[PDB]
Structure formats: structure tokens, C-alpha cells
Design an enzyme around this catalytic site. Sequence first.
Site, mmCIF file in Angstrom:
data_model
loop_
_atom_site.group_PDB
_atom_site.id
_atom_site.type_symbol
_atom_site.label_atom_id
_atom_site.label_comp_id
_atom_site.label_asym_id
_atom_site.label_seq_id
_atom_site.Cartn_x
_atom_site.Cartn_y
_atom_site.Cartn_z
ATOM 1 C CG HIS A 1 53.399 -13.106 64.924
ATOM 2 N ND1 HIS A 1 52.426 -12.672 64.049
ATOM 3 C CD2 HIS A 1 53.461 -14.454 64.786
ATOM 4 C CE1 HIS A 1 51.915 -13.715 63.410
ATOM 5 N NE2 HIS A 1 52.525 -14.810 63.836
ATOM 6 N N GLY B 1 50.379 -22.102 61.971
ATOM 7 C CA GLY B 1 51.481 -22.464 61.092
ATOM 8 C C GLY B 1 51.391 -21.713 59.783
ATOM 9 C CB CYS C 1 51.723 -16.371 60.400
ATOM 10 S SG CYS C 1 50.177 -16.235 61.318
HETATM 11 C C1 LIG Z 1 49.983 -17.828 62.273
HETATM 12 C C2 LIG Z 1 51.137 -17.842 63.345
HETATM 13 C C3 LIG Z 1 52.191 -18.894 63.002
HETATM 14 C C4 LIG Z 1 53.360 -19.174 63.963
HETATM 15 O O1 LIG Z 1 52.147 -19.486 61.945
HETATM 16 C C5 LIG Z 1 48.645 -17.706 62.961
HETATM 17 C C6 LIG Z 1 47.372 -17.805 61.951
HETATM 18 C C7 LIG Z 1 46.019 -18.054 62.630
HETATM 19 C C8 LIG Z 1 45.842 -19.412 63.470
HETATM 20 C C9 LIG Z 1 44.338 -19.813 63.300
HETATM 21 N N1 LIG Z 1 43.979 -19.193 62.015
HETATM 22 C C10 LIG Z 1 44.918 -18.187 61.633
HETATM 23 O O2 LIG Z 1 44.834 -17.496 60.602
HETATM 24 N N2 LIG Z 1 48.634 -16.389 63.567
HETATM 25 C C11 LIG Z 1 48.265 -16.223 64.936
HETATM 26 O O3 LIG Z 1 47.956 -17.246 65.612
HETATM 27 C C12 LIG Z 1 48.220 -14.871 65.614
HETATM 28 C C13 LIG Z 1 49.549 -14.424 66.335
HETATM 29 C C14 LIG Z 1 49.645 -12.995 66.973
HETATM 30 C C15 LIG Z 1 49.275 -11.929 65.920
HETATM 31 C C16 LIG Z 1 51.023 -12.617 67.562
HETATM 32 N N3 LIG Z 1 47.128 -14.863 66.581
HETATM 33 C C17 LIG Z 1 45.767 -15.041 66.139
HETATM 34 O O4 LIG Z 1 45.503 -15.199 64.886
HETATM 35 C C18 LIG Z 1 44.658 -15.126 67.171
HETATM 36 C C19 LIG Z 1 43.894 -16.452 67.140
HETATM 37 N N4 LIG Z 1 42.730 -16.408 68.050
HETATM 38 C C20 LIG Z 1 42.933 -16.707 69.461
HETATM 39 O O5 LIG Z 1 44.090 -16.996 69.869
HETATM 40 C C21 LIG Z 1 41.782 -16.688 70.456
HETATM 41 C C22 LIG Z 1 41.664 -18.058 71.135
HETATM 42 C C23 LIG Z 1 42.037 -15.597 71.491
HETATM 43 C C24 LIG Z 1 40.442 -16.312 69.739
HETATM 44 N N5 LIG Z 1 43.734 -14.021 66.960
HETATM 45 C C25 LIG Z 1 43.730 -12.888 67.789
HETATM 46 O O6 LIG Z 1 44.533 -12.787 68.769
HETATM 47 O O7 LIG Z 1 42.822 -11.871 67.467
HETATM 48 C C26 LIG Z 1 42.700 -10.821 68.475
HETATM 49 C C27 LIG Z 1 41.619 -11.217 69.453
HETATM 50 C C28 LIG Z 1 40.187 -11.032 69.092
HETATM 51 C C29 LIG Z 1 39.227 -11.391 69.966
HETATM 52 C C30 LIG Z 1 39.590 -11.979 71.300
HETATM 53 C C31 LIG Z 1 40.897 -12.153 71.639
HETATM 54 C C32 LIG Z 1 41.962 -11.755 70.677
#
Ligand SMILES: *[C@@H](CC(C)=O)[C@H](C[C@@H]1CCNC1=O)NC(=O)[C@H](CC(C)C)NC(=O)[C@H](CNC(=O)C(C)(C)C)NC(=O)OCc1ccccc1
Length: 306
Positions: free
Chosen positions: A41, A143, A145
Site C-alpha cells: 500500500h 508512519g 507501516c
Molecule cells: C501505516 C501506513 C504508513 C504510510 O505508514 C498505517 C498504520 C496505522 C495508522 C494508525 N495506527 C496504525 O496502525 N497503516 C494505515 O493507515 C492503513 C493503510 C491501508 C491498509 C492502505 N489504514 C488503516 O490502518 C486504517 C486506519 N483507520 C481509519 O482510517 C478510519 C478513520 C477509517 C477508522 N484502518 C482501516 O482502514 O481499517 C478498515 C476499516 C474498519 C472500520 C471502518 C473503516 C475502515
Amino acid sequence: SGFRKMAFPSGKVEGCMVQVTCGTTTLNGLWLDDTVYCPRHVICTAEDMLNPNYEDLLIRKSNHSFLVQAGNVQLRVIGHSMQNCLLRLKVDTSNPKTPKYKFVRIQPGQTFSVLACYNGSPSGVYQCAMRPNHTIKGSFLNGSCGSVGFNIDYDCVSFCYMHHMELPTGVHAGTDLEGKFYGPFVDRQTAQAAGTDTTITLNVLAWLYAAVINGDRWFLNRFTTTLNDFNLVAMKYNYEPLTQDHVDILGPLSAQTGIAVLDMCAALKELLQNGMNGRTILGSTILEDEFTPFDVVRQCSGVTFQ
Ligand SMILES: *[C@@H](CC(C)=O)[C@H](C[C@@H]1CCNC1=O)NC(=O)[C@H](CC(C)C)NC(=O)[C@H](CNC(=O)C(C)(C)C)NC(=O)OCc1ccccc1
């Protein structure tokens, strides 16, 4: 002598963390020999994240689309490919610090160390257990991931987790180093919720043995129980049923302490039904389930405090 949630020394892993950037998205990668692994991602964007088609997204990128940084040095990417939810970036230089290692797929209940990283720089380290519902209770911000989970045995590093996301309940999800997720999760921001979790019975028992090893026998009793009688109380308290294999794994601890497994289960069943009495076990007021039988032997004295 003490019992602490202890992580493995992180040095061998620190020497493999790098930063990877794509456009505006930056995260961590793992540099082993001449390959850098990272969450696929990193090739996503603003809206790319709800419904990304990675195959599609990736065909639109070139080796030069990827910016890999090993500290202050820039690593030149000479080839790329996607393996499940990770990207494998080949680069022109082979990490001089690569340790002996292997990739493992940890099982539910097992524990590992996590090296929280940001912009390719190691920030902190703590132990986590893979929960039965395939999430881990970590501490991660944006940050993070690409941060990895690992165990060390001798001088071999067994990588087993790469961080990818956080679910609504504040719990975390990721993949093994082949990029296959632990759990039924997918790397896209569509609603997903962790499944119901259970207490890891085998670990709680391993922890009672540790409590006895460094002295402390207060919760024991004169009773015993059969596996099934135990499992009926277990179901009631949302604990995982205990099995004969589990009973067998607790053999060495049982032996070193002279306490029979089913006697310890009898002790646990009482703890579960009669509460704790405002008393603590290994400094704890709750039954801990994040230490395996392996973790206990590793950390505790090979000699019990009789
Ligand atoms: C690392 C990405 C980078 C560039 O470092 C992050 C780690 C997370 C940030 C906060 N704590 C973490 O562990 N990874 C992501 O942000 C990740 C990217 C996707 C897989 C392409 N997305 C999520 O972790 C995301 C965070 N939650 C949200 O954005 C909201 C506001 C929607 C809750 N989680 C997610 O999308 O879970 C699916 C989901 C569940 C329930 C409702 C909507 C979505």
C-alpha cells in the site's frame, strides 16, 4: 527474581530498517541482502486507499518510482514485484548488516517482539502475542507501516510480522513476510472489524507455573479436575478449551515445579470462579495470557524456589 514482559535485543533488526517513499506516501521497509520488503500500500494515495487495485496501481510504476533510503544513503532499486500484500524491491546494494534469518508464520497464542519504526528509524521495542482473533495489541501511529515483529534464536532472526493497519477497536493487523495477512483482513480502507477474542488458556497456565517458579504458591489448592470439567468452566469465562497437546506442552514446567497440570487447571478454575481476593500473581491483579510456556522457561530460573 522477577518476571517481566521482555522483548528480544533489537540490534540485528535495527540494522535492516529503511525508509521507502512513493509520491507523498512514506513508510518502513526491511532490507535483507539485496531486497527491500514493504507494505504494497505504499503505492496508494488519497482515494487509492478505499478500493485500490494493486495490480493495476503497480503496472503504472517504474523502478525509479520507488525512493529507498538506508539512513542517509540512497538505495537504487533495480527491479520490483508484488508478493501478496508486500512489494519486493530488488536494489543494487546488498545490506552489509543482514543477519542470519528466516521468515516464519507465527501461530495464534505465540509471542514476538515488535520494533516500532518511523521514517526508517527504530523508535521502540515491546513484546506482543498474536491474539486468537489474529490481531495484536500494539502501539502504532501513522508512519509505522513496514515495522516488523520477530523472535531471535541463537543468532538467527525469525521475522514473522509486518505492520499494515489499525482496526476500530484500536487493535492491529498485518502480515507475515510473504505478505499473507494474519486473519481475514485486507489492505484497503473498507469497514472491517476484528472477530471476537478469547483468553489464551495455555499461556495463563504457563504464567501460573512462572509464578510458582520464582516462589508463590498461594493460589494452589488440593483439588484436581478432568479436562472436560475444566473446559466447561473455560467456555463460561471465554477461555480457549484446553487440549491434551496443551497439557503435554506444560510437561517440563509441571515437572520442574512438581505441580500436576490438571491440579494447576483446578487451581485456575478456582481463580476464575472465586476471583482473586485483592491478591496479586507475579505483581498482577489479572490473569496474564501473553506469555507462552516457551517464554517462561526462557526467562525464569531453571531452578524453582521451593
Ligand atoms: C501505516 C501506513 C504508513 C504510510 O505508514 C498505517 C498504520 C496505522 C495508522 C494508525 N495506527 C496504525 O496502525 N497503516 C494505515 O493507515 C492503513 C493503510 C491501508 C491498509 C492502505 N489504514 C488503516 O490502518 C486504517 C486506519 N483507520 C481509519 O482510517 C478510519 C478513520 C477509517 C477508522 N484502518 C482501516 O482502514 O481499517 C478498515 C476499516 C474498519 C472500520 C471502518 C473503516 C475502515
